[PDB]
């Protein structure tokens, strides 16, 4: 039998996918997770005890972003191994394609939290290879179900590209994307590109946004804003065509935005 339900913080969450918590753990009905250190436990009683003893009230590593009560922590898999393993097992409950859980040393993890008087509460994360041959600026990205559809995922995507910009390089999420992942990246790419054509070659857009030319082209194609002339993709849009898309119900602007002023981060 698999883990099919977790209790974390004040939430109970049903699993979407198999996650390889150890047999005894992963043959318990429900796992209880400390929302701060992500230790997983078998019993309500061991969970209650731990809550009284655990002194963590935020993720480990460095707080590299903080605006109002939104916080991002940068966590090196090498320095912070158990925590990152616990994070990956948690993540795997909601990711179909994640294959890596214990071998966390090659990754850096960016943890999103909502802060209040009690502590910094985990919302989601993304992982990123320290060295990615495929130029992936995201390995996996996950927002916990009770926080989904509220702009946190868009925030993390935007955040991952701010990192890429600061690294002066283009980046793309590692494939295959979930359907939810595709919806979110298509939505993000479209907004960013449209806004850049409201207020330019594909080469220029890629340099300005750190979106890869491939992702720009596929996005522009879905928007019918590219012409194809003898094997070159050429941007073809009118400033009013741009604005029709942005003004429609399709593109909302009530986001949480990444404020570069609140980002404390120097490139690897
Ligand atoms: C590289 C990879 O990691 S691939 C796998 C991606 N990760 C996962 O699948 C983990 C499980 N899924 C998730 O955690 C989330 O669904 C994520 C990370 C994909 C998105 O996070 P969310 O906070 O829910 O997305 P967010 O609120 O920012 O909305 C982003 C956009 O995607 C759309 N969207 C998000 N979820 C849905 C959904 N079920 N149905 C339709 N549209 C959706 C939103 O409408 C929005 O578009 P819009 O601005 O035009 O309205
Ligand atoms: Na649920
Ligand atoms: Na669920
Ligand atoms: Na459910
Ligand atoms: Zn704990």
Q: Are residues 33 and 69 in the same domain?
A: no
Instruction: Tell me the three state secondary structure of residue 151.
Output: coil
Report residue 12 as tokens.
């109970």
Strand 107-115 to strand 120-129: parallel, antiparallel, or no bridges (unpaired)?
A: antiparallel
Give 251's DSSP letter.
Answer: S
Its domain, for residue 1, covers 1-55
126 and 140 Cβ atoms separated by less than 8 Å: yes
Q: Domain count of the chain?
A: 2
Residue recorded with tokens 């699993």? 15
Same domain (yes/no): 10, 83: no
Name residue 107's beta-bridge partners: 129
5 forms bridges with which residues in the sheet? Answer: 14, 30
Residue 161: count other Cβ atoms within 10 Å of its Cβ: 22
Cited resolution, angstroms: 1.9
Report the relative pairing of strands 232-235 and 40-41 from DSSP bridges: unpaired
Choose one of 55, 75, 100: the last residue of a domain.
55
> In which element (H, E) is residue 246 found?
helix 239-247
Ligand nearest to the CA of 11: 2
178 near 137, Cβ under 8 Å? no
Q: Domain containing 151 — which CATH number?
A: 3.40.630.30
Question: Is 243 one of the annotated active-site residues of the chain?
Answer: no
Identify which of 70, 122, 141 to mutate to test ligand 1's pocket (most ligand atoms within 8 A of the CB). Answer: 141
Euclidean distance between CA atoms 90 and 143, whole angstroms: 11
Instruction: Name the residue at shortest CA distance from atom 42 of ligand 1.
Output: 183
Active-site residue, from 12, 162, 174, 244 = 174
All residues at 6 or more sequence positions from 109 whose CB lies less than 8 Å from its CB, including other chains? 61, 74, 75, 76, 77, 80, 84, 87, 125, 126, 127, 128
């Amino acid at each position: 039998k698999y883990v099919d339900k977790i209790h974390i913080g004040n939430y109970e969450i049903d699993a979407w996918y198999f996650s390889p918590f150890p047999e005894d753990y992963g043959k318990q009905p429900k796992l209880w997770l400390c929302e701060y250190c992500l230790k997983y436990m078998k019993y309500e009683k061991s969970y209650r005890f731990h809550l009284g003893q655990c002194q963590w009230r935020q993720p480990p590593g460095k707080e590299i972003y903080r605006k109002s009560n939104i916080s991002v922590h940068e966590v090196d898999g090498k320095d912070h191994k158990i925590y990152c393993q616990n994070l990956c097992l948690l993540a795997k409950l909601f990711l179909d394609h994640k294959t890596l859980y214990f071998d966390v040393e090659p990754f850096v993890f960016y943890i999103l939290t909502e802060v209040d008087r009690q502590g910094a509460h985990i919302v989601g994360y993304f992982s990123k290879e320290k060295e990615s041959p495929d130029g992936n600026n995201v390995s996996c990205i996950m927002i916990l179900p009770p926080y989904q559809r509220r702009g946190y995922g868009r925030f993390l995507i935007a955040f991952s590209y701010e990192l890429s910009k600061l690294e002066s390089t283009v980046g793309s999420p590692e494939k295959p994307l979930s359907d939810l992942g595709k919806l979110s990246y298509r939505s993000y790419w479209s907004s960013v590109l449209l806004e850049n054509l409201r207020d330019l070659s594909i080469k220029d857009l890629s340099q300005m946004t750190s979106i890869t030319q491939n992702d720009i082209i596929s996005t522009l194609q879905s928007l019918n804003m590219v012409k194809y002339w003898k094997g070159q993709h050429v941007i073809c849009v009118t400033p009013k065509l741009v604005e029709e898309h942005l003004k429609s119900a399709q593109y909302k602007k009530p986001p949480i935005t990444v404020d570069s002023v609140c980002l404390k981060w120097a490139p690897p």
